[PDB]
Amino acid sequence: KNIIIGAMTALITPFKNGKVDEQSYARLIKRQIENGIDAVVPVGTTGESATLTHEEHRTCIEIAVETCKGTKVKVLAGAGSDATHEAVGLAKFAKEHGADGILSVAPYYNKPTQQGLYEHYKAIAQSVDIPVLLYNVPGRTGCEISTDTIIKLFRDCENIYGVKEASGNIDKCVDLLAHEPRMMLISGEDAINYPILSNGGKGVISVTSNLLPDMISALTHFALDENYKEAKKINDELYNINKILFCESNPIPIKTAMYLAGLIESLEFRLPLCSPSKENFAKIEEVMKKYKIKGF
Amino acid sequence: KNIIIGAMTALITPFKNGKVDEQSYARLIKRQIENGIDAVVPVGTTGESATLTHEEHRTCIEIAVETCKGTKVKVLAGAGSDATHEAVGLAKFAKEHGADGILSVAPYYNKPTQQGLYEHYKAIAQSVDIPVLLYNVPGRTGCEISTDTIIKLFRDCENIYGVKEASGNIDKCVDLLAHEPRMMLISGEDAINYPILSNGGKGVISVTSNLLPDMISALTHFALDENYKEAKKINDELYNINKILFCESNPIPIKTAMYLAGLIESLEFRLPLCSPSKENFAKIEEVMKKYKIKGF
Amino acid sequence: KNIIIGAMTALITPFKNGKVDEQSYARLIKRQIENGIDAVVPVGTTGESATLTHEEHRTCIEIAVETCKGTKVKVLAGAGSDATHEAVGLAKFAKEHGADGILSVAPYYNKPTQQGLYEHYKAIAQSVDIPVLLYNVPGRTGCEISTDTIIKLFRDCENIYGVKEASGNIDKCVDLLAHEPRMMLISGEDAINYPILSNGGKGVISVTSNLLPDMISALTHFALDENYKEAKKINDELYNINKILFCESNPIPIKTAMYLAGLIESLEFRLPLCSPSKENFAKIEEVMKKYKIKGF
Amino acid sequence: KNIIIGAMTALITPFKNGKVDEQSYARLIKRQIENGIDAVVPVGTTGESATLTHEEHRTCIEIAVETCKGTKVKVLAGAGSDATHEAVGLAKFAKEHGADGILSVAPYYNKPTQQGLYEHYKAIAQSVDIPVLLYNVPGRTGCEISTDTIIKLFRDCENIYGVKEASGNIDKCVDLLAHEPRMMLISGEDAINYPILSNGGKGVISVTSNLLPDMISALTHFALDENYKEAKKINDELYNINKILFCESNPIPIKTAMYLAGLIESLEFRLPLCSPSKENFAKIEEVMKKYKIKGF
Ligand SMILES: [Mg+2]
Ligand SMILES: [Mg+2]
Ligand SMILES: [Mg+2]
Ligand SMILES: [Mg+2]
DSSP states (O other), X not given: OOOOOEXXXXXXXXXXXXXXXXXXXXXXXXXXXXXXXXXXXXXXXXXXXXXXXXXXXXXXXXXXXXXHTTSSOEEEEEOOOXXXXXXXXXXXXXXXTTOSEEEEEOOOSSOOOHHHHHHHHHHHHHHOSSOEEEXXXXXXXXXXXXXXHHHHHHHXXXXXXXXXXXXXXXXXXXXXXXXXXXXXXXXXXXXGHHHHHHTTOOEEEESGGGTOXXXXXXXXXXXXXXXXXXXXXXXXXXXXXXXXXXXXXXXXXXXXXXXXXXXXXXXXXXTTOOOOOHHHHHHHHHHHTTSOOOXX | OOOOOEEEEEOOOOEETTEEOHHHHHHHHXXXXXXXXXXXXXXXXXXXXXXXXXXXXXXXXXXXXXXXXXXXXXXXXEOOOSSHHHHHHHHHHHHHTTOSEEEEEOOOSSOOOXXXXXXXXXXXXXXXXXXXXXXXXXXXXXXXXXXXXXXXXXXXXXXXXXEEEOSSOHHHHHHXXXXXXXXXXXXXXXXXXXXXXXXXXXXXXXXXXXXXXXXXXXXXXXXXXXXXXXXHHHHHXXXXXXXXXXXXXXXXXXXXXXXXXXXXXXXXXXXXXXXXXXXXXXXXXXHHTTSOOOXX | OOOOOEEEEEOOOOEETTEEOHHHHHHHHHHHHHTTOOEEETTSTTTTGGGSOHHHHHHHHHHHHHHHTTSSOEEEEEOOOSSHHHHHHHHXXXXXXXXXXXXEEOXXXXXXXXXXXXXXXXXXXXXXXXXXXXXXXXXXXXXXOOHHHHHHHHHHOTTEEEEEEOSOOHHHHHHHHHHOTTSEEEEOOGGGHHHHHHTTOOEEEESXXXXXXXXXXXXXXXXXXXXXXXXXXHHHHTHHHHHHTTSSSTTHHHHHHHHHTTSSSOOOOOTTOOOOOHXXXXXXXXXXXXXXXXXX | OOOXXXXXXXXXXXXXXXXXXXXXXXXXXXXXXXXXOSEEETTSTTTTGGGSOHHHHHHHHHHHHHHHTTSSOEEEEEOOOSSHHHHHHHHXXXXXXXXXXXXXXXXXXXOOOHHHHHHHHHHHHHHOSSOEEEEEOHHHHSOOOOHHHHHHHHHHOSXXXXXXXXXXXXXXXXXXXXXXXXXXXXXXXXGGHHHHHHTXXXXXXXXXXXXXXXXXXXXXXXXXXXXXXXXXXXXXXXXXXXXXXXXXXXXXXXXXXXXXXXXXXXXXXXXTOOOOOHHHHHHHHHHHTTSOOOOO
């Protein structure tokens, strides 16, 4: 299969006066490229995909594609939906705009059955000829793509090559790779990047890498080179920031951290997301003190 | 406050050849009206709001408004979204399409903080001058509107008049009405309709009432008259069907039952929803035999 | 069946210099009797049964039996264990010491299957000729007596007459009484005493009644007479104290409250239980100021 | 600190006509020694400690100590209790009976606070001069030893050297070893033995090793020698048996497998534990056929 693996960043989407700051966005993607990232994920969960318009979705993908031109860095575009017809259209659109692959979140809110999830992803995979990464985050969606459904999709659909797991369940990661060792398991939970990689995971889609792209890329590349000692050392050092970046719902902490570090101009979200509490604002600032944050 | 309470039905959305069956939809609402229902909820969770287009959202609301004209039955239109700007637009559309009130689900997937939830609903409430009922279903959304946030919204916003609770948490129902006895607590979980009403709840938004509107109507009106003995009797008799209607994710079982009862032509869903398993199809059919299902 | 229902108190066990304060214990029981309580539960969870010796178990049961003599008040002795051979011995023990019935918690820690739970309680019930109340508290035991297992035990074992439910699950309470309306469902969760009673529950085994026995007794008798308005009023008024009495693991808050009220001489627990933090000590003290606490 | 690490077995306790089969117990331990195990754990959870008498506790510890004498295999005796005074006595008795260290489960059922857990284990640690391993299994105890409490106990008490984790929470494993890399984190959940070891865990206390001691000891020794490829291979191969051994509550499946393998004479438990369902009996038998089971 064609795959998209390695160190990847779920890009935040900076706002300026309520609009997407397109210049800041490209600047941030170039900063990821210059710090060893292998792929960028525009308009994922961390990018506030839920509150962007379809045109903003396209703008972010196009900027990502344009900024990665002439580099090895791939664009794995977020294109999920709770409606299969919309997810198919979003997958096709992302392919139009030049994306290298698709990240497709499991349907949220409507809690489809495993049979429904299979038909959902089959339709998406059959609509394009680029790689498709499943995305399991039951804490957000209210549903879980079971191991059996993931493996069936991997084996039955040419484009589907793995899953981004954000479920806090290392047992499921063992289950997945013990029964289907050919799939690409991608960590969607920064604090446990190293345990997923050390079990045969092949990449991360990281929130923390927005702030510390050099450290996350180094961790991932050490692990991929089977230098497990050095990968674990970075994972252990990153634990404090990895956890504080979820003291409130992502991406509220990571955007707060990017603002405190001077990497974005304004601490601006789109409702229903908003600024953190003053206490959590201060807690994030404290945790950042121990880390060296790359500039532009 | 202006309120919409009593026995209410979360209307299923019948499909025919991939399209909303507009004739069937009106016929089902008329059947609800003729069996003692006090309000209907077009395009809620049970109505597959996630997979309908904006045009189909508009059409279902318009059919409900037109069908309820000249009756006492109110239209409480589903108008929630995980994007505040989108929820505001849907609320304004429902008011302009003639809805009597709004049912607004808590933002799904992006997990806003309580502060974000407050600002989200404040913006919705200020955009219209019709009643707004909050809707808490953390099993589907991944977030919980806290009692403090519900009570703050009730006291701060004139049009927010209560909450549809679908959280299986009777402790919270006590918490809500002990600290704010003026709000309208509405049961969003059929199996525990009677316990919520007996604690001072003033209505239900029911899945079961699609199939058994006369029984749910009788249950609610018995309870509202403090005939708790007769209300509990109906709630107990309904437990088996109330539970089997969630053997798979709602609305898969209720649509299956409506099809088995001859109330809809086609057992059609929009992906990622699909037909139940063969075993659950047979279990739903068996449980239905205990109950007298009104026709048209 | 022979039953023990009504307003019942899970008695705290006061300590003085590391030993059971036997005079205080008797005086506290008399105070419960004089404030309308229908039965007392020595050496339940609230009585720190886990850290008492078998000799101290006997002493508490004997004091309860002797103090209730010549009154209508029954003694429902705690007699559970995670070992069936030990639970049988404790049940026979309590019957021999003159207890009117036994409360037998589901086996903790070793997580028996439903079949094992059935055989466990069958063995206890066949060992005595006094009523047996099951006790489901999965948050403490790590296991759940299913509705099916409870109903089978009620129907198959003559002395098993109901269950004390401490699971926060009003759906299960509907399930239990809809399928077996002859059983005695007893609330083991103070905050939701009224909802359980209004669905046909026939008593409470209360923590709060240690502090406010007159209020819990009145709530229960209002509810048993279907004076739901009055019962709900008390339940709502009690919500704040009902919740603060679990700000730390019971019986740490209730013993703190009893000490603050002057009802026990020393705030002494047996390890691993200990004094609350200073912040929760102050929270309990503040909440108590809203309630009228009866003396001796 | 003095430590007990490596591949360890939570020994089942075979019964014959209701009594501990002492000859079988010795035979099974010698079998563990012959297949590379580094320590044995008599009368843990897997050993049905809850239903053994004090005299049976001593017999099992004495048989383990004598069978391991003159070998390098250590005896890590189960000595926990929900009562601190009892846990202190059990620790002293295990020491007197010749154990090399103690495994002390967190108090079950009574749910002590973190302050209470600290004082509980401090009292245990001060009562003996042999190593003490904490044991966190919240699914059984209803309480969790927090990372902060574990680390404080490790730093404040000379005998306390690590924790057996059975919580399915690899995030906590990173948390523990990132903040206190000197502690001995021991896997108490077979399915994730390799992920815990690859993050710096230093041993396992295994259920599966009762049946497959050679495979578990090799997995552990591969991992400790930093041969992660071979450790993961065994962990992946063992996943099916690792999961089926918990299709019902441990130790019901492992005793069933040991009986099916001919390693014990009778499939006898002490109530409330009992034989598995006929369906799970067959599933266990089917899974076992894929594995080479060492004899005596
Ligand atoms: Mg296949
Ligand atoms: Mg009207
Ligand atoms: Mg309802
Ligand atoms: Mg009337």
